[PDB]
Coordinates of C-alpha atoms and ligand atoms in Angstrom, one line a residue:
Chain A
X1 CA 129.7 -83.9 61.1
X2 CA 132.5 -85.9 59.6
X3 CA 131.8 -88.8 62.1
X4 CA 128.1 -88.9 61.4
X5 CA 128.4 -92.0 59.2
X6 CA 130.3 -94.1 61.8
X7 CA 128.6 -96.4 64.3
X8 CA 128.8 -95.2 67.9
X9 CA 130.5 -98.4 69.0
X10 CA 133.1 -98.0 66.2
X11 CA 133.8 -94.4 67.3
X12 CA 134.4 -95.6 70.9
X13 CA 136.6 -98.5 69.7
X14 CA 138.7 -96.1 67.6
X15 CA 138.9 -93.6 70.4
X16 CA 140.6 -96.4 72.5
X17 CA 142.9 -97.2 69.6
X18 CA 143.8 -93.5 69.2
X19 CA 144.6 -93.4 73.0
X20 CA 147.0 -96.3 72.6
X21 CA 148.6 -94.6 69.6
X22 CA 148.8 -91.3 71.5
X23 CA 146.8 -89.7 68.7
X24 CA 144.8 -87.3 70.9
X25 CA 143.4 -85.1 68.2
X26 CA 141.9 -88.1 66.5
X27 CA 140.7 -89.4 69.9
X28 CA 138.9 -86.1 70.6
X29 CA 137.3 -86.2 67.1
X30 CA 136.0 -89.7 67.7
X31 CA 134.7 -88.9 71.1
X32 CA 133.0 -85.7 69.8
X33 CA 131.4 -87.9 67.2
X34 CA 130.2 -90.3 69.9
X35 CA 128.7 -87.6 72.0
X36 CA 126.9 -86.3 69.0
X37 CA 125.0 -89.6 68.6
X38 CA 122.8 -88.2 71.3
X39 CA 123.0 -90.9 74.0
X40 CA 124.5 -90.4 77.4
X41 CA 128.1 -91.5 78.0
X42 CA 129.1 -94.3 80.4
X43 CA 131.8 -93.8 83.0
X44 CA 134.5 -95.2 80.8
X45 CA 133.3 -93.1 77.8
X46 CA 133.4 -89.9 79.9
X47 CA 137.0 -90.7 80.8
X48 CA 137.9 -91.1 77.1
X49 CA 136.3 -87.8 76.3
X50 CA 138.1 -86.0 79.1
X51 CA 141.5 -87.5 78.4
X52 CA 141.3 -86.8 74.7
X53 CA 140.6 -83.1 75.1
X54 CA 142.9 -82.7 78.1
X55 CA 145.8 -83.8 76.0
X56 CA 144.9 -81.7 73.0
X57 CA 144.5 -78.5 75.0
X58 CA 147.5 -79.5 77.2
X59 CA 149.8 -79.4 74.2
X60 CA 148.3 -76.1 73.1
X61 CA 148.7 -74.6 76.6
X62 CA 152.3 -75.7 76.8
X63 CA 153.0 -74.1 73.4
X64 CA 151.1 -70.9 74.3
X65 CA 153.1 -70.6 77.5
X66 CA 156.4 -70.9 75.6
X67 CA 155.4 -68.3 73.0
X68 CA 153.9 -65.9 75.6
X69 CA 157.2 -66.1 77.6
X70 CA 159.1 -65.2 74.4
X71 CA 156.7 -62.4 73.7
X72 CA 156.9 -60.8 77.2
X73 CA 160.7 -60.7 77.1
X74 CA 160.5 -59.0 73.7
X75 CA 158.6 -56.2 75.5
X76 CA 161.3 -55.7 78.2
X77 CA 163.5 -52.7 78.2
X78 CA 166.6 -53.4 76.2
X79 CA 164.9 -56.0 74.0
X80 CA 165.6 -55.6 70.3
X81 CA 162.5 -55.0 68.1
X82 CA 161.8 -58.0 66.0
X83 CA 158.4 -57.3 64.3
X84 CA 155.0 -58.7 64.7
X85 CA 155.8 -62.4 64.2
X86 CA 156.0 -63.5 67.9
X87 CA 152.7 -61.8 68.7
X88 CA 151.1 -63.2 65.5
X89 CA 152.1 -66.8 66.1
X90 CA 151.1 -66.6 69.8
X91 CA 147.7 -65.3 68.6
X92 CA 147.5 -68.3 66.2
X93 CA 148.1 -70.8 68.9
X94 CA 145.8 -68.9 71.3
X95 CA 142.9 -68.9 68.7
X96 CA 143.3 -72.6 68.1
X97 CA 143.3 -73.2 71.9
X98 CA 140.2 -71.1 72.3
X99 CA 138.5 -73.0 69.5
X100 CA 139.1 -76.3 71.2
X101 CA 137.8 -75.0 74.6
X102 CA 134.8 -73.6 72.8
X103 CA 134.2 -77.0 71.2
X104 CA 134.3 -78.8 74.5
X105 CA 132.1 -76.2 76.2
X106 CA 129.6 -76.6 73.3
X107 CA 129.5 -80.4 73.8
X108 CA 129.0 -79.9 77.6
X109 CA 126.1 -77.5 76.9
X110 CA 124.7 -79.7 74.0
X111 CA 123.6 -81.6 75.8
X112 CA 125.8 -83.6 78.3
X113 CA 125.2 -81.5 81.3
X114 CA 121.4 -81.1 80.6
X115 CA 120.8 -84.9 80.7
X116 CA 123.3 -85.8 83.4
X117 CA 121.3 -86.6 86.6
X118 CA 123.6 -89.0 88.4
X119 CA 126.1 -87.3 90.6
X120 CA 129.0 -89.0 89.0
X121 CA 128.2 -87.8 85.6
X122 CA 126.9 -84.3 86.6
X123 CA 129.9 -83.5 88.7
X124 CA 132.3 -84.8 86.1
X125 CA 130.8 -82.6 83.4
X126 CA 130.6 -79.5 85.5
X127 CA 134.2 -80.0 86.5
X128 CA 135.1 -80.2 82.8
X129 CA 133.1 -76.9 82.3
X130 CA 135.1 -75.2 85.0
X131 CA 138.4 -76.6 83.6
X132 CA 137.8 -75.3 80.1
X133 CA 136.7 -71.9 81.2
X134 CA 139.8 -71.9 83.3
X135 CA 141.9 -72.6 80.3
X136 CA 140.2 -69.8 78.5
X137 CA 140.9 -67.6 81.5
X138 CA 144.6 -68.3 81.3
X139 CA 144.8 -66.5 77.9
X140 CA 142.1 -63.9 78.5
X141 CA 142.9 -60.2 78.9
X142 CA 136.4 -60.3 79.1
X143 CA 138.7 -62.1 81.6
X144 CA 136.5 -61.4 84.6
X145 CA 133.4 -62.9 82.9
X146 CA 135.3 -66.0 82.0
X147 CA 136.7 -66.3 85.5
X148 CA 133.2 -66.0 86.8
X149 CA 131.9 -68.7 84.5
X150 CA 134.7 -71.1 85.7
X151 CA 133.9 -70.3 89.3
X152 CA 130.2 -70.9 88.9
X153 CA 130.7 -74.3 87.2
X154 CA 133.2 -75.4 89.8
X155 CA 130.9 -74.3 92.7
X156 CA 127.9 -76.2 91.4
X157 CA 130.1 -79.2 90.9
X158 CA 131.4 -78.8 94.5
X159 CA 128.0 -78.5 96.0
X160 CA 126.8 -81.7 94.4
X161 CA 130.0 -83.6 95.1
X162 CA 129.9 -82.8 98.8
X163 CA 126.2 -83.8 99.1
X164 CA 126.4 -86.9 96.9
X165 CA 129.9 -88.4 97.0
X166 CA 132.2 -89.6 99.7
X167 CA 135.3 -87.5 100.4
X168 CA 137.7 -90.0 98.8
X169 CA 135.7 -90.3 95.5
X170 CA 138.3 -89.6 92.8
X171 CA 136.0 -87.2 90.8
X172 CA 135.3 -85.3 94.0
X173 CA 139.0 -85.1 94.8
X174 CA 140.1 -84.1 91.3
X175 CA 137.4 -81.3 91.3
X176 CA 138.7 -80.0 94.6
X177 CA 142.3 -80.1 93.3
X178 CA 141.5 -78.1 90.2
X179 CA 139.2 -75.7 92.0
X180 CA 142.0 -75.0 94.5
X181 CA 144.4 -74.4 91.6
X182 CA 141.8 -72.0 90.1
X183 CA 141.7 -70.0 93.3
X184 CA 145.5 -69.9 93.5
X185 CA 146.5 -69.3 89.9
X186 CA 143.4 -67.6 88.3
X187 CA 141.3 -65.9 91.0
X188 CA 144.0 -64.3 93.1
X189 CA 142.7 -66.2 96.2
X190 CA 145.7 -68.2 97.6
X191 CA 144.2 -68.4 101.0
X192 CA 141.0 -70.0 99.6
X193 CA 143.2 -72.3 97.6
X194 CA 145.1 -73.5 100.6
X195 CA 142.0 -73.8 102.8
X196 CA 140.2 -75.9 100.1
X197 CA 143.2 -78.2 99.5
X198 CA 143.8 -78.8 103.2
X199 CA 140.2 -79.5 104.1
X200 CA 139.9 -81.8 101.1
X201 CA 143.1 -83.7 102.1
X202 CA 142.2 -84.0 105.7
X203 CA 138.7 -85.3 105.1
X204 CA 139.9 -87.7 102.5
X205 CA 142.5 -89.1 105.0
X206 CA 139.7 -89.8 107.5
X207 CA 137.7 -91.6 104.8
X208 CA 140.5 -93.7 103.5
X209 CA 139.4 -96.7 105.5
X210 CA 136.3 -96.9 103.2
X211 CA 138.1 -96.3 99.9
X212 CA 137.9 -99.1 97.3
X213 CA 140.9 -101.0 96.0
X214 CA 139.5 -100.0 92.5
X215 CA 139.9 -96.3 93.2
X216 CA 142.9 -96.4 95.6
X217 CA 145.5 -95.4 93.1
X218 CA 143.5 -92.7 91.5
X219 CA 142.6 -91.1 94.8
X220 CA 146.0 -91.5 96.3
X221 CA 147.6 -89.9 93.3
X222 CA 145.2 -86.9 93.6
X223 CA 145.8 -86.7 97.4
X224 CA 149.5 -86.5 96.7
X225 CA 149.0 -83.7 94.2
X226 CA 147.0 -81.8 96.9
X227 CA 149.8 -82.4 99.3
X228 CA 152.4 -81.3 96.6
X229 CA 150.5 -78.1 96.0
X230 CA 150.2 -77.4 99.7
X231 CA 154.0 -77.9 100.1
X232 CA 154.4 -75.4 97.2
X233 CA 152.0 -72.9 98.6
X234 CA 153.0 -72.9 102.3
Chain B
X1 CA 151.0 -75.5 91.0
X2 CA 149.9 -78.8 89.5
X3 CA 146.7 -80.3 88.2
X4 CA 146.8 -83.9 87.0
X5 CA 149.3 -84.3 84.2
Chain C
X1 CA 149.5 -71.8 49.3
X2 CA 148.4 -70.6 52.7
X3 CA 151.9 -69.2 53.4
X4 CA 152.1 -67.3 50.1
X5 CA 151.4 -63.9 51.8
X6 CA 154.0 -64.2 54.5
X7 CA 157.6 -62.9 54.1
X8 CA 160.2 -65.5 53.8
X9 CA 162.1 -64.2 56.8
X10 CA 158.9 -64.3 58.9
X11 CA 158.3 -67.9 57.9
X12 CA 161.8 -68.8 59.1
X13 CA 161.4 -66.8 62.3
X14 CA 158.1 -68.6 63.0
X15 CA 159.5 -72.0 62.2
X16 CA 162.1 -71.4 64.9
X17 CA 159.3 -70.3 67.3
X18 CA 157.3 -73.5 66.4
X19 CA 160.4 -75.6 67.1
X20 CA 160.8 -74.0 70.6
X21 CA 157.1 -74.7 71.2
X22 CA 157.4 -78.2 69.9
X23 CA 154.7 -77.4 67.3
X24 CA 156.2 -79.5 64.5
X25 CA 153.2 -79.5 62.2
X26 CA 153.2 -75.7 62.2
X27 CA 157.0 -75.8 61.8
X28 CA 156.7 -78.0 58.7
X29 CA 154.1 -75.7 57.2
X30 CA 156.2 -72.6 57.8
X31 CA 159.3 -74.3 56.2
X32 CA 157.3 -75.6 53.2
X33 CA 156.1 -72.0 52.7
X34 CA 159.8 -70.9 52.9
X35 CA 160.9 -73.5 50.4
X36 CA 158.1 -72.4 48.0
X37 CA 159.5 -68.8 47.9
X38 CA 161.9 -70.3 45.3
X39 CA 165.2 -69.4 46.9
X40 CA 167.8 -72.0 48.0
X41 CA 167.9 -72.8 51.7
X42 CA 170.9 -72.1 54.0
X43 CA 172.5 -74.8 56.1
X44 CA 170.4 -73.6 59.2
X45 CA 167.2 -73.5 57.1
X46 CA 167.8 -77.1 55.8
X47 CA 168.1 -78.2 59.4
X48 CA 164.8 -76.6 60.2
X49 CA 163.1 -78.2 57.3
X50 CA 164.5 -81.7 58.2
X51 CA 163.7 -81.5 61.9
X52 CA 160.1 -80.3 61.3
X53 CA 159.1 -83.1 58.9
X54 CA 161.2 -85.7 60.9
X55 CA 159.1 -85.0 63.9
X56 CA 155.8 -85.0 62.1
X57 CA 156.4 -88.3 60.3
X58 CA 158.0 -89.7 63.4
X59 CA 154.8 -89.4 65.4
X60 CA 152.9 -90.9 62.5
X61 CA 155.3 -93.8 62.3
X62 CA 155.1 -94.5 66.0
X63 CA 151.3 -94.5 65.8
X64 CA 151.3 -96.7 62.7
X65 CA 153.5 -99.2 64.4
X66 CA 151.2 -99.3 67.5
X67 CA 148.1 -99.9 65.3
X68 CA 149.8 -102.4 62.9
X69 CA 150.8 -104.4 65.9
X70 CA 147.2 -104.5 67.2
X71 CA 146.1 -105.4 63.7
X72 CA 148.4 -108.3 63.3
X73 CA 147.5 -109.8 66.6
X74 CA 143.8 -109.5 65.6
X75 CA 144.7 -111.9 62.7
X76 CA 146.4 -114.5 64.9
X77 CA 144.6 -117.9 65.5
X78 CA 142.4 -117.6 68.5
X79 CA 141.9 -113.9 68.1
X80 CA 138.3 -112.8 68.5
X81 CA 136.8 -111.0 65.4
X82 CA 136.3 -107.3 66.1
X83 CA 135.3 -105.8 62.8
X84 CA 137.0 -103.5 60.4
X85 CA 137.8 -100.7 62.8
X86 CA 141.5 -101.5 63.5
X87 CA 142.3 -101.9 59.8
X88 CA 140.3 -98.7 59.0
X89 CA 142.1 -96.6 61.6
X90 CA 145.5 -98.0 60.7
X91 CA 144.7 -97.1 57.0
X92 CA 143.8 -93.6 58.1
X93 CA 147.1 -93.0 59.8
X94 CA 148.9 -94.7 57.0
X95 CA 147.3 -92.5 54.4
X96 CA 148.2 -89.4 56.4
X97 CA 151.8 -90.6 56.8
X98 CA 152.0 -91.3 53.0
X99 CA 150.7 -87.8 52.3
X100 CA 153.4 -86.2 54.4
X101 CA 156.1 -88.3 52.7
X102 CA 154.7 -87.3 49.4
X103 CA 154.7 -83.6 50.4
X104 CA 158.4 -83.8 51.4
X105 CA 159.3 -85.7 48.3
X106 CA 157.5 -83.1 46.2
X107 CA 159.5 -80.3 47.8
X108 CA 162.8 -82.1 47.2
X109 CA 161.8 -82.6 43.6
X110 CA 160.5 -79.0 43.2
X111 CA 163.1 -77.9 43.2
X112 CA 165.5 -78.3 46.1
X113 CA 167.6 -81.1 44.6
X114 CA 167.6 -79.6 41.1
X115 CA 169.3 -76.4 42.3
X116 CA 171.6 -77.9 45.0
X117 CA 175.1 -77.9 43.7
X118 CA 177.2 -77.8 46.8
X119 CA 177.9 -81.2 48.3
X120 CA 176.5 -80.2 51.7
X121 CA 173.1 -79.3 50.3
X122 CA 173.0 -82.0 47.6
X123 CA 173.9 -84.8 50.0
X124 CA 171.5 -83.4 52.6
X125 CA 168.5 -83.4 50.2
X126 CA 169.3 -86.8 48.6
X127 CA 169.6 -88.3 52.1
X128 CA 166.1 -86.8 52.9
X129 CA 164.8 -88.3 49.7
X130 CA 166.1 -91.8 50.7
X131 CA 164.7 -91.3 54.2
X132 CA 161.1 -90.5 53.0
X133 CA 161.1 -93.3 50.5
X134 CA 162.2 -95.5 53.3
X135 CA 159.3 -94.3 55.5
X136 CA 157.0 -95.1 52.6
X137 CA 158.6 -98.5 52.3
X138 CA 157.9 -99.3 55.9
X139 CA 154.1 -99.3 55.2
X140 CA 154.2 -100.5 51.6
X141 CA 152.9 -104.0 50.6
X142 CA 154.6 -101.5 44.9
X143 CA 157.0 -102.0 47.8
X144 CA 159.9 -103.1 45.6
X145 CA 159.7 -99.9 43.5
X146 CA 159.7 -97.8 46.6
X147 CA 162.6 -99.7 48.0
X148 CA 164.5 -99.2 44.8
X149 CA 163.8 -95.4 44.9
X150 CA 165.1 -95.2 48.4
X151 CA 168.3 -97.1 47.5
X152 CA 168.9 -95.0 44.4
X153 CA 168.7 -91.8 46.4
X154 CA 170.9 -93.0 49.2
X155 CA 173.4 -94.4 46.7
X156 CA 173.8 -91.0 44.9
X157 CA 174.1 -89.3 48.2
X158 CA 176.8 -91.8 49.3
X159 CA 178.8 -91.3 46.1
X160 CA 178.9 -87.6 46.5
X161 CA 179.6 -87.6 50.2
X162 CA 182.6 -90.0 49.8
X163 CA 184.1 -87.8 47.0
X164 CA 183.4 -84.4 48.5
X165 CA 183.2 -84.7 52.3
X166 CA 185.6 -85.9 55.1
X167 CA 184.6 -89.1 56.9
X168 CA 183.6 -87.3 60.0
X169 CA 181.3 -84.8 58.3
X170 CA 178.0 -85.2 60.3
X171 CA 175.8 -85.2 57.1
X172 CA 178.1 -88.0 55.6
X173 CA 177.9 -89.9 58.9
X174 CA 174.1 -89.6 59.3
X175 CA 173.6 -90.7 55.7
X176 CA 175.7 -93.8 56.3
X177 CA 173.8 -94.5 59.5
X178 CA 170.4 -94.3 57.8
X179 CA 171.5 -96.2 54.7
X180 CA 172.9 -99.0 56.9
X181 CA 169.5 -99.1 58.7
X182 CA 167.8 -99.3 55.3
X183 CA 169.9 -102.3 54.4
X184 CA 169.2 -104.0 57.7
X185 CA 165.5 -103.2 58.2
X186 CA 164.1 -102.6 54.7
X187 CA 166.3 -104.4 52.1
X188 CA 167.0 -107.7 53.8
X189 CA 170.7 -107.1 53.6
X190 CA 172.1 -107.3 57.1
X191 CA 175.6 -108.1 56.0
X192 CA 175.7 -104.9 53.8
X193 CA 174.3 -103.0 56.8
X194 CA 177.0 -104.3 59.1
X195 CA 179.8 -103.7 56.6
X196 CA 178.6 -100.1 55.9
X197 CA 178.3 -99.2 59.6
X198 CA 181.7 -100.7 60.5
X199 CA 183.6 -99.1 57.6
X200 CA 181.9 -95.8 58.3
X201 CA 182.8 -96.0 62.0
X202 CA 186.4 -97.1 61.5
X203 CA 187.1 -94.4 58.9
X204 CA 185.5 -91.7 61.1
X205 CA 187.7 -92.8 64.1
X206 CA 190.8 -92.2 62.0
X207 CA 189.6 -88.8 60.9
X208 CA 188.6 -87.6 64.4
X209 CA 191.9 -85.7 64.8
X210 CA 190.6 -83.3 62.1
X211 CA 187.0 -83.0 63.3
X212 CA 185.9 -79.5 64.3
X213 CA 184.7 -78.6 67.8
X214 CA 181.6 -77.2 66.1
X215 CA 180.6 -80.7 64.8
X216 CA 182.2 -82.9 67.5
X217 CA 179.0 -83.5 69.4
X218 CA 176.9 -84.2 66.3
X219 CA 179.4 -86.6 64.8
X220 CA 180.2 -88.3 68.1
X221 CA 176.5 -88.8 68.6
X222 CA 176.1 -90.4 65.2
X223 CA 179.2 -92.5 65.7
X224 CA 177.7 -93.8 68.9
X225 CA 174.5 -94.7 67.1
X226 CA 176.6 -96.6 64.5
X227 CA 178.3 -98.4 67.4
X228 CA 174.9 -99.1 69.1
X229 CA 173.5 -100.6 65.9
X230 CA 176.6 -102.8 65.4
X231 CA 176.3 -104.0 69.0
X232 CA 172.6 -104.8 68.3
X233 CA 173.4 -106.5 64.9
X234 CA 176.5 -108.6 65.9
Chain D
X1 CA 168.0 -100.6 65.1
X2 CA 168.1 -96.8 65.6
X3 CA 168.3 -93.8 63.3
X4 CA 168.6 -90.3 65.1
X5 CA 165.7 -89.8 67.5
Ligands
HY5_301 C1 138.8 -94.9 79.7 C2 140.1 -95.3 79.4 C3 141.3 -94.5 80.0 C4 142.5 -95.4 80.0 C5 141.5 -93.2 79.2 O1 141.0 -94.1 81.4 C6 142.0 -93.3 82.0 C7 141.9 -93.4 83.5 O2 140.4 -93.2 83.9 C8 140.2 -93.5 85.3 O3 140.9 -92.5 86.1 C9 140.2 -91.3 86.0 C10 141.3 -90.2 85.5 C11 142.7 -90.0 86.1 C12 143.3 -90.9 87.2 C13 143.9 -89.9 88.2 C14 144.4 -91.7 86.5 N1 144.9 -92.7 87.6 C15 146.3 -93.0 87.7 O4 147.1 -92.6 86.9 C16 146.8 -94.0 88.9 C17 148.3 -93.9 89.2 C18 147.7 -95.1 88.4 C19 143.4 -89.1 85.2 C20 142.5 -89.0 83.9 O5 142.7 -87.7 83.4 C21 141.1 -89.2 84.4 C22 140.2 -89.8 83.3 C23 140.5 -87.9 84.8 C24 139.7 -87.5 86.1 C25 139.3 -86.2 86.3 C26 138.1 -85.9 85.3 O6 137.6 -84.6 85.5 C27 136.5 -84.3 84.6 C28 138.7 -86.2 87.8 C29 139.5 -87.4 88.5 C30 139.9 -88.3 87.6 C31 139.0 -89.6 87.7 C32 137.8 -89.5 86.7 C33 139.8 -90.9 87.5 O7 139.0 -91.9 88.0 C34 140.7 -94.9 85.7 O8 140.4 -95.2 87.1 C35 142.1 -95.0 85.4 O9 142.6 -96.3 85.7 C36 142.4 -94.7 84.0 O10 143.8 -94.7 83.8
HY5_302 C1 168.3 -75.2 62.9 C2 168.0 -75.2 64.2 C3 167.9 -76.6 64.9 C4 167.9 -76.4 66.4 C5 166.6 -77.3 64.5 O1 169.0 -77.4 64.5 C6 169.0 -78.8 65.0 C7 170.5 -79.3 64.9 O2 171.0 -79.0 63.6 C8 172.5 -79.4 63.5 O3 172.6 -80.8 63.8 C9 172.2 -81.5 62.6 C10 171.1 -82.5 63.0 C11 171.2 -83.5 64.2 C12 172.4 -83.5 65.2 C13 172.8 -85.0 65.3 C14 171.9 -83.0 66.6 N1 173.1 -83.0 67.4 C15 173.0 -83.3 68.9 O4 172.0 -83.6 69.3 C16 174.3 -83.2 69.7 C17 174.3 -84.0 71.0 C18 174.2 -82.5 71.0 C19 169.9 -84.1 64.4 C20 168.9 -83.2 63.5 O5 167.9 -84.1 63.1 C21 169.8 -82.7 62.4 C22 169.2 -81.3 61.8 C23 169.7 -83.7 61.2 C24 170.9 -84.3 60.4 C25 170.7 -85.3 59.4 C26 169.9 -84.6 58.2 O6 169.7 -85.5 57.2 C27 169.1 -84.9 56.0 C28 172.1 -85.7 58.9 C29 173.0 -85.5 60.2 C30 172.4 -84.4 61.0 C31 173.3 -83.1 60.8 C32 172.7 -82.2 59.7 C33 173.5 -82.3 62.1 O7 174.5 -81.4 61.8 C34 173.3 -78.6 64.6 O8 174.7 -78.9 64.6 C35 172.7 -79.0 66.0 O9 173.4 -78.2 67.0 C36 171.3 -78.7 66.1 O10 170.8 -79.2 67.3
CL303 CL1 151.3 -67.0 62.5
CL304 CL1 139.1 -94.4 60.8
NA305 NA1 124.6 -97.9 67.0
NA306 NA1 160.7 -59.8 62.1
NA307 NA1 161.5 -61.3 51.3
NA308 NA1 133.8 -103.7 65.8

């Protein structure tokens, strides 16, 4: 790979520079290079990996949604025929998005998840796996199998997190938030989504008297997003 | 519905 | 080129879709493809070309400034030595930025400027030429020749605009705004920058009773930026 | 100093 000649520590240093410069494509490339050195990632390094690809795919998702919206209106009654360009360009963005998801999933499978034994790394990577199958599901039309893959990854992450992490652990909370969104937006299970978000919120509240000052802002933010969703859903 | 932004 | 098989009208349509999706790299590629069909661009098409590349290079410039700032502090007394990574990554962004500027300048020279006879197209393209030499000047350290190229392009644009356009024409105003910034930021001529901005503002004020409703917001915005700069500079 | 954003 193009990063094969760069020191691991240099890749990490440049990923942090790319983050400061909001150069997320570069950041992802540097972190892919770091993963491919074959050593496990630290907590800080996992965060760099996730933020890089989250921002890359986030921009692709936002663009895909803009184009898909334009495409669907072009297929409403009364809409003037305009040729294949909207579909073509939506497909172009879609294919690029799928390629990024496939790249992330390949890294997780080679071999981050295999070597992750600690709960904090294993749940983190399985959550990522669920997240990127979910992003694939958003554009899939095939779709059932992708949805099943997302659910299986989220479920294994959930089982570990509940056995090995306190309720206010930010990774546990962020997994529950995203799995509840999966239920609501992807899997047509709004009641499961609401139940998961509420149980997660309530149990985190009762655990707050143990939560570290370190993690307070992360976990409070995610708790507020759980609350925001519940307000939106109920 | 929101995930972390 | 990769866009050689796509219809000109399809390239324009996809450039507009890319703009809506904030996919500026795609937008620039589509508009480069359109220019390379060999026909002159309309007013609307020139705007698409300029906005696409403005946003591409804008992001590169913002990243370059972040990295250069980190680099200069690494060279202050007391700064811990950290290796070549900051310089290397700044150089990477810099080279990419220069490549985009070179691409724009090549399009302007092949053959947009040559075939542009109307004042509105010729001033537009010469302003672009000054702008992208200016962006090259910002990272140059060589620099004098690039600064001279920017000045020559801006000056020819200025001479045409004053002979052929009313003072409130938005292209004339935006050229004067950017040329005044060139004087202040690039050419070490703050007094020339202030004189140009003030003369431009004052003459546009006296012409406002002729300005079209079409162009009122564009020209008022640029007039406010001239005023903002003058407040910053005086 | 600002140019159009
Ligand atoms: C390594 C360097 C950088 C700067 C990139 O790190 C980024 C963050 O990484 C940790 O936060 C992560 C984190 C957050 C938190 C919510 C950011 N919090 C705030 O906005 C508080 C209001 C101030 C969003 C991210 O997408 C990230 C990395 C992602 C995950 C997510 C990962 O699913 C695989 C599960 C939860 C959350 C968990 C893992 C959180 O712990 C730090 O604690 C934060 O300080 C730090 O900003
Ligand atoms: C073709 C489709 C799209 C949507 C991309 O067009 C964009 C704009 O193109 C014309 O505006 C151009 C224009 C503007 C104006 C200031 C935007 N005004 C506002 O924000 C008003 C507050 C509401 C900034 C751009 O960078 C652009 C294209 C650039 C130039 C600049 C080009 O140097 C080579 C010189 C002046 C300005 C001149 C050329 C202005 O006329 C329209 O008039 C605008 O409506 C329109 O938004
Ligand atoms: Cl396309
Ligand atoms: Cl580099
Ligand atoms: Na090493
Ligand atoms: Na068409
Ligand atoms: Na044609
Ligand atoms: Na170093």
